[PDB]
Design a protein around this ligand. Structure first.
Ligand SMILES: O=C([O-])c1cc(Br)ccc1N[C@H]1CCCNC1
Ligand SMILES: O=C([O-])c1cc(Br)ccc1N[C@H]1CCCNC1
Lengths: 157, 157
């Protein structure tokens, strides 16, 4: 019990509340979730078919992106949310699932389910970087895209 | 200053050392990494093309599975390792990179590289469950396997 360890605990506790708020943001509130980020904050999808992240850079770019997300995922809900604090008061991981309609132009409407890991890094009590990690193959299934198969001959039984 | 907290600090420090040893295990030493697990411990890959985990259940099977892994990935190394402690002294996350030759039956020999998240849960100081999460698209690439391209029409820049 020193004031340095109290600052850290207080930081972790405020940061965790923002992670919880993030993960419970649904419907039209998603249009304001960008306000949880620093001005230069980054969010987006780190696991894509291309092998490069799609990074959305800036609090304002993030609010613009939320209009596209709400259109394409109109009823998205995160479930089975488990929040992991780390040794770093400004860095959290979340393991969860999610489910909802997927409405991408040039594909049929589908139902998308996946398992997700999210990384949340903070600066001054606001999110500086959010990254989502998932298995893009499940998104291919939701879009009617054929999923390649890797054969693992010899893989012990 | 309670011994229930010295109880956990001790568990966490010991477990962290087991995560470090796991993540630095290379070459022939991989044939013995299964000895870091509880008798009933589980390892494997949670992000597959099939959408289901390939879980390797038990110390003995993990030992048998390493023979396959060492053949298919003869020079595998994990790099850029970041270990994350959590509020649970028996739960850790690792973010890292990995690369090496990939040598599968029926595919041209390749070079596989990916970004990985590992989950490690402990029991009595041995690994009770290890799970790897990666982007399966990067492994398709390494095998010469075509990766479909998701189109995100209307996605802002
Ligand atoms: O899933 C995507 O293709 C996607 C890509 C970027 Br770029 C941002 C948000 C995306 N989707 C929402 C809803 C589903 C769960 N992940 C967040
Ligand atoms: O990568 C796989 O296809 C794979 C599948 C299972 Br089942 C166990 C180990 C596997 N590979 C090692 C080496 C490469 C990185 N990941 C762990």
């Amino acid at each position: 019990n020193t004031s340095e360890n109290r600052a850290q605990v207080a930081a972790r506790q405020h940061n965790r509340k923002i992670v919880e708020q993030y993960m419970h943001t649904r419907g039209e509130a998603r249009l304001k979730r960008h306000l949880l980020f620093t001005e230069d904050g980054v969010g987006g999808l780190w696991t894509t078919d291309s092998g490069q992240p799609i990074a959305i850079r800036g609090r304002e770019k993030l609010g613009e992106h939320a209009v596209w997300s709400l259109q394409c995922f109109p009823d998205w809900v995160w479930t089975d949310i488990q929040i992991f604090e780390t040794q770093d008061p400004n860095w959290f991981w979340v393991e969860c699932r999610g489910e909802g309609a997927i409405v991408f132009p040039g594909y049929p409407r589908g139902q998308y389910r996946n398992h997700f890991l999210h990384s949340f890094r903070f600066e001054n009590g606001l999110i500086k970087e959010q990254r989502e990690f998932m298995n893009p193959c499940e998104q291919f299934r939701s879009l009617g895209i054929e999923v390649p198969e890797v054969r693992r001959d010899g893989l012990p039984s």
